[PDB]
Design a protein around this nucleic acid. Structure first.
Ligand SMILES: *C(=O)c1cnc2ccccc2n1
Ligand SMILES: *C(=O)c1cnc2ccccc2n1
Length: 8
DNA sequence: GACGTC
DNA sequence: GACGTC
């Protein structure tokens, strides 16, 4: 759920 | 070494 | 249970 390297 | 929701 | 880039 967080976006810092993938964003899901 | 750093972040959590569809 | 899914997703890695600075
Ligand atoms: C987002 O909340 C989140 C949390 N845990 C994860 C584990 C694996 C892939 C993606 C994820 N996303
Ligand atoms: C992104 O590629 C990525 C990879 N590992 C992580 C570990 C902990 C927090 C965030 C992260 N992001």
């Amino acid at each position: 759920x967080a976006x810092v390297x993938a964003x899901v």
